[PDB]
Design a protein around this ligand. Structure first.
Ligand SMILES: C[N+]1(C)[C@@H]2C[C@@H](OC(=O)[C@H](CO)c3ccccc3)C[C@H]1[C@@H]1O[C@@H]12
Length: 369
């Protein structure tokens, strides 16, 4: 079965690399070719997509060659450049997640001061500072530690970080570069989720949700559920208010008067007309939303959970490796490493495949024009 496993591993690894490259390239190009996708969040996600792209192109393929061949074939220089590369990139991705978490935390805790300084140049300076800090932290030690000590203990055919020859050093690295950032992002997400936990915002949110659910509906029950719940939220949104009060009160009545005419068509047997009243509900909605004036936290939690779940096994393998070396076979190390790579694979699916503008931009990129 070992001969079969070589082929299966090559196919699975190459497939994962290709999916990573295609996804992150789609994200980056989508952000660059669409101005509507040019915000601070999409700048942070742009840098994250760049790091995941570098992991998909260089790290996955070189590690696949390393494990499949059984030893390092490219030499010591390419080994040091590879280790420094994926280590710097991974560090920059971690501090990028920290940047996103602190950015959202300051958005929810300082609404009257932070958003005015939240511009494009500031986000670019933060990203550049993250990449430079990662390079300074990891590149000189990995590349030049052998010259600092005066001897290269990495024999021919091997490829590993030299100063990681001691287990406690690797464990301290795991604590400083993973566990503490994970705890920081967990506390920050805790305060953000407790901050989102105002009423009329949730009412109108429910309205624009179910109103599009009517259009996306495949069968008949979805239009009735979205209708009824949207109308409970519509009346509860009518009683709440931020003579303009008579017009505010006269948006929901002219809304409901036709709403019951739509639900009347929802129970008659022909749902195509009931769904055809949606655009009219919208052109009536515009007059109210003119005088009227979370998904982001969901995305953040998705990315954070992807990072933690994909990077936890390797780090617990380090913690166990401190006091027991035979407790972790080589295959297990390969599995954990590859999961840490899988983070970059599943990263674009946590924000790109859940945003409508990203969907339309993807469709626009994969079509004729
Ligand atoms: C590419 N990896 C698979 C390598 C091994 C792991 O290293 C870590 O988990 C440590 C913290 O234990 C780490 C090092 C640098 C940056 C972030 C984490 C995951 C990533 C990271 O670039 C290395």
């Amino acid at each position: 079965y070992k001969t079969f496993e070589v082929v299966f591993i090559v196919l699975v690894a190459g497939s994962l690399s290709l999916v990573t490259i295609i996804g992150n390239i789609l994200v980056m190009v989508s952000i660059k070719v669409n101005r509507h996708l040019q915000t601070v969040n999409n700048y942070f996600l742009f840098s994250l997509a760049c790091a995941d792209l570098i992991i998909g192109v260089f790290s996955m393929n070189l590690y696949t060659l390393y494990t499949v061949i059984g030893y390092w074939p490219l030499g010591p220089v390419v080994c040091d450049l590879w280790l420094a590369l994926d280590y710097v990139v991974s560090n920059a991705s971690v501090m990028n997640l920290l940047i996103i978490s602190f950015d959202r935390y300051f958005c929810v805790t300082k609404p009257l001061t932070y958003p005015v300084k939240r511009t494009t140049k500031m986000a670019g300076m933060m990203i550049a500072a993250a990449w430079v800090l990662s390079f300074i932290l990891w590149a000189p030690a990995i590349l030049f530690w052998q010259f600092i000590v005066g001897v290269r203990t990495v024999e021919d055919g091997e490829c590993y970080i030299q100063f990681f020859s001691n287990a406690a050093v690797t464990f301290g690295t795991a604590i400083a570069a993973f566990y503490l950032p994970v705890i920081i992002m967990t506390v920050l997400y805790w305060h953000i989720s407790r901050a989102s936990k105002a009423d009329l915002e949730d009412n109108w949110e429910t309205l624009n949700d179910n109103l599009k659910v009517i259009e996306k509906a495949d069968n008949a029950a979805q239009v009735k559920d979205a209708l009824t719940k949207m109308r409970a939220a519509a009346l509860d949104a009518q009683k709440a208010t931020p003579p303009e009060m008579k017009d505010f009160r006269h948006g929901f009545d002219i809304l409901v008067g036709q709403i019951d005419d739509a639900l009347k068509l929802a129970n008659e047997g022909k749902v195509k007309e009931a769904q055809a009243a949606a655009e009219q509900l919208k052109t009536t909605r515009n007059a109210y939303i003119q005088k009227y004036l979370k998904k982001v936290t969901r995305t953040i939690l998705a990315i954070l959970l992807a990072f933690i779940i994909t990077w936890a096994p390797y780090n617990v393998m380090v913690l166990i490796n401190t006091f027991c070396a035979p407790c972790i076979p080589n295959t297990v190390w390969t599995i954990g490493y590859w999961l840490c790579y899988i983070n970059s694979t599943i990263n674009p699916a946590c924000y790109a495949l859940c945003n409508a503008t990203f969907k339309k931009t993807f469709k626009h990129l994969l079509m004729c024009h």
